[PDB]
PDB file of C-alpha atoms in Angstrom:
ATOM      1  CA  UNK A   1     -47.474 -11.129  13.307  1.00  0.00           C
ATOM      2  CA  UNK A   2     -47.221 -10.913  10.155  1.00  0.00           C
ATOM      3  CA  UNK A   3     -48.402  -7.331   9.854  1.00  0.00           C
ATOM      4  CA  UNK A   4     -45.416  -6.174  12.896  1.00  0.00           C
ATOM      5  CA  UNK A   5     -42.649  -8.889  11.370  1.00  0.00           C
ATOM      6  CA  UNK A   6     -43.307  -6.530   7.626  1.00  0.00           C
ATOM      7  CA  UNK A   7     -43.895  -3.174  10.408  1.00  0.00           C
ATOM      8  CA  UNK A   8     -39.751  -3.611  11.476  1.00  0.00           C
ATOM      9  CA  UNK A   9     -38.695  -5.696   8.562  1.00  0.00           C
ATOM     10  CA  UNK A  10     -39.487  -2.873   5.826  1.00  0.00           C
ATOM     11  CA  UNK A  11     -38.577   0.045   8.885  1.00  0.00           C
ATOM     12  CA  UNK A  12     -35.025  -1.115   8.681  1.00  0.00           C
ATOM     13  CA  UNK A  13     -34.722  -2.578   5.335  1.00  0.00           C
ATOM     14  CA  UNK A  14     -35.035  -5.906   6.214  1.00  0.00           C
ATOM     15  CA  UNK A  15     -38.064  -7.191   3.593  1.00  0.00           C
ATOM     16  CA  UNK A  16     -40.818  -9.280   4.577  1.00  0.00           C
ATOM     17  CA  UNK A  17     -42.460 -11.526   2.899  1.00  0.00           C
ATOM     18  CA  UNK A  18     -44.036 -14.085   4.524  1.00  0.00           C
ATOM     19  CA  UNK A  19     -44.844 -17.931   2.011  1.00  0.00           C
ATOM     20  CA  UNK A  20     -46.630 -20.467   3.871  1.00  0.00           C
ATOM     21  CA  UNK A  21     -44.614 -23.557   1.725  1.00  0.00           C
ATOM     22  CA  UNK A  22     -44.901 -26.529   4.209  1.00  0.00           C
ATOM     23  CA  UNK A  23     -47.762 -28.813   5.885  1.00  0.00           C
ATOM     24  CA  UNK A  24     -45.997 -31.471   8.062  1.00  0.00           C
ATOM     25  CA  UNK A  25     -42.894 -32.185   9.923  1.00  0.00           C
ATOM     26  CA  UNK A  26     -40.387 -35.466  10.786  1.00  0.00           C
ATOM     27  CA  UNK A  27     -43.175 -38.358  10.771  1.00  0.00           C
ATOM     28  CA  UNK A  28     -45.617 -37.269  13.861  1.00  0.00           C
ATOM     29  CA  UNK A  29     -46.494 -33.074  14.077  1.00  0.00           C
ATOM     30  CA  UNK A  30     -48.743 -31.110  12.378  1.00  0.00           C
ATOM     31  CA  UNK A  31     -46.030 -27.722  11.895  1.00  0.00           C
ATOM     32  CA  UNK A  32     -46.532 -26.152   8.796  1.00  0.00           C
ATOM     33  CA  UNK A  33     -43.208 -24.895   8.100  1.00  0.00           C
ATOM     34  CA  UNK A  34     -43.687 -20.999   6.727  1.00  0.00           C
ATOM     35  CA  UNK A  35     -40.695 -18.639   4.829  1.00  0.00           C
ATOM     36  CA  UNK A  36     -40.458 -15.114   5.925  1.00  0.00           C
ATOM     37  CA  UNK A  37     -38.365 -13.602   3.996  1.00  0.00           C
ATOM     38  CA  UNK A  38     -36.265 -11.032   5.487  1.00  0.00           C
ATOM     39  CA  UNK A  39     -33.247  -8.688   4.328  1.00  0.00           C
ATOM     40  CA  UNK A  40     -32.154 -10.356   1.577  1.00  0.00           C
ATOM     41  CA  UNK A  41     -31.889 -14.119   2.867  1.00  0.00           C
ATOM     42  CA  UNK A  42     -34.977 -16.788   4.267  1.00  0.00           C
ATOM     43  CA  UNK A  43     -36.321 -17.009   7.617  1.00  0.00           C
ATOM     44  CA  UNK A  44     -38.648 -19.694   7.705  1.00  0.00           C
ATOM     45  CA  UNK A  45     -41.015 -21.082  10.483  1.00  0.00           C
ATOM     46  CA  UNK A  46     -42.355 -24.329  11.860  1.00  0.00           C
ATOM     47  CA  UNK A  47     -45.647 -23.473  13.465  1.00  0.00           C
ATOM     48  CA  UNK A  48     -47.524 -26.174  14.953  1.00  0.00           C
ATOM     49  CA  UNK A  49     -49.843 -25.885  13.084  1.00  0.00           C
ATOM     50  CA  UNK A  50     -52.083 -24.706   9.598  1.00  0.00           C
ATOM     51  CA  UNK A  51     -53.040 -20.935  11.330  1.00  0.00           C
ATOM     52  CA  UNK A  52     -50.013 -21.206  13.437  1.00  0.00           C
ATOM     53  CA  UNK A  53     -47.000 -21.472  11.366  1.00  0.00           C
ATOM     54  CA  UNK A  54     -47.535 -17.315  10.610  1.00  0.00           C
ATOM     55  CA  UNK A  55     -47.179 -16.266  13.642  1.00  0.00           C
ATOM     56  CA  UNK A  56     -44.557 -18.891  14.529  1.00  0.00           C
ATOM     57  CA  UNK A  57     -43.194 -18.140  11.325  1.00  0.00           C
ATOM     58  CA  UNK A  58     -42.693 -14.522  11.922  1.00  0.00           C
ATOM     59  CA  UNK A  59     -41.637 -15.054  15.433  1.00  0.00           C
ATOM     60  CA  UNK A  60     -39.460 -16.997  14.636  1.00  0.00           C
ATOM     61  CA  UNK A  61     -38.565 -14.152  11.957  1.00  0.00           C
ATOM     62  CA  UNK A  62     -38.226 -11.006  13.896  1.00  0.00           C
ATOM     63  CA  UNK A  63     -36.959 -13.184  16.873  1.00  0.00           C
ATOM     64  CA  UNK A  64     -33.687 -13.859  14.696  1.00  0.00           C
ATOM     65  CA  UNK A  65     -33.023  -9.968  14.190  1.00  0.00           C
ATOM     66  CA  UNK A  66     -34.723  -8.355  16.949  1.00  0.00           C
ATOM     67  CA  UNK A  67     -32.790 -10.122  19.722  1.00  0.00           C
ATOM     68  CA  UNK A  68     -29.369  -9.992  17.847  1.00  0.00           C
TER      69      UNK A  68
END
Protein backbone atom coordinates (compact mmCIF):
# COMPACT_ATOMS: atom_id res chain seq x y z
CA UNK A 1 0.00 0.00 0.00
CA UNK A 2 2.86 2.42 0.78
CA UNK A 3 5.16 1.35 -2.07
CA UNK A 4 2.22 1.96 -4.44
CA UNK A 5 1.67 5.52 -3.21
CA UNK A 6 5.38 6.36 -3.14
CA UNK A 7 5.29 4.98 -6.70
CA UNK A 8 2.65 7.37 -8.08
CA UNK A 9 2.98 10.13 -5.48
CA UNK A 10 6.66 10.53 -6.38
CA UNK A 11 6.25 9.42 -10.01
CA UNK A 12 4.04 12.48 -10.57
CA UNK A 13 5.00 14.98 -7.84
CA UNK A 14 2.89 14.04 -4.78
CA UNK A 15 5.39 13.56 -1.93
CA UNK A 16 4.46 10.25 -0.25
CA UNK A 17 5.33 10.23 3.46
CA UNK A 18 3.34 7.79 5.63
CA UNK A 19 3.43 8.42 9.40
CA UNK A 20 1.04 6.72 11.86
CA UNK A 21 0.24 9.25 14.61
CA UNK A 22 -2.88 7.65 16.11
CA UNK A 23 -3.99 4.30 17.60
CA UNK A 24 -7.70 4.54 18.46
CA UNK A 25 -11.04 6.17 17.55
CA UNK A 26 -13.92 8.03 19.22
CA UNK A 27 -14.51 5.54 22.05
CA UNK A 28 -15.00 2.03 20.61
CA UNK A 29 -12.98 0.98 17.54
CA UNK A 30 -9.25 0.20 17.21
CA UNK A 31 -8.61 2.55 14.27
CA UNK A 32 -5.20 4.12 13.60
CA UNK A 33 -5.21 7.45 11.74
CA UNK A 34 -2.14 7.08 9.56
CA UNK A 35 -1.15 10.47 8.16
CA UNK A 36 0.08 10.05 4.59
CA UNK A 37 1.52 13.29 3.18
CA UNK A 38 0.93 13.89 -0.52
CA UNK A 39 2.23 16.71 -2.76
CA UNK A 40 2.24 19.69 -0.36
CA UNK A 41 -0.85 18.80 1.72
CA UNK A 42 -1.32 15.88 4.15
CA UNK A 43 -3.89 13.12 3.75
CA UNK A 44 -4.25 10.72 6.71
CA UNK A 45 -6.55 7.69 6.91
CA UNK A 46 -7.96 5.82 9.93
CA UNK A 47 -7.28 2.17 9.04
CA UNK A 48 -9.20 -0.07 11.49
CA UNK A 49 -6.31 -1.99 13.10
CA UNK A 50 -2.58 -1.54 13.79
CA UNK A 51 -1.06 -3.12 10.66
CA UNK A 52 -4.01 -1.86 8.58
CA UNK A 53 -3.50 1.86 9.33
CA UNK A 54 -0.93 1.67 6.50
CA UNK A 55 -3.23 0.10 3.89
CA UNK A 56 -6.06 2.47 4.88
CA UNK A 57 -3.87 5.60 5.01
CA UNK A 58 -2.40 4.88 1.55
CA UNK A 59 -5.66 3.70 -0.06
CA UNK A 60 -7.10 6.95 1.29
CA UNK A 61 -4.18 8.85 -0.30
CA UNK A 62 -4.04 7.22 -3.75
CA UNK A 63 -7.83 6.96 -3.85
CA UNK A 64 -7.72 10.65 -2.81
CA UNK A 65 -5.78 11.93 -5.86
CA UNK A 66 -6.08 8.83 -8.07
CA UNK A 67 -9.83 8.95 -8.79
CA UNK A 68 -10.23 12.72 -9.22
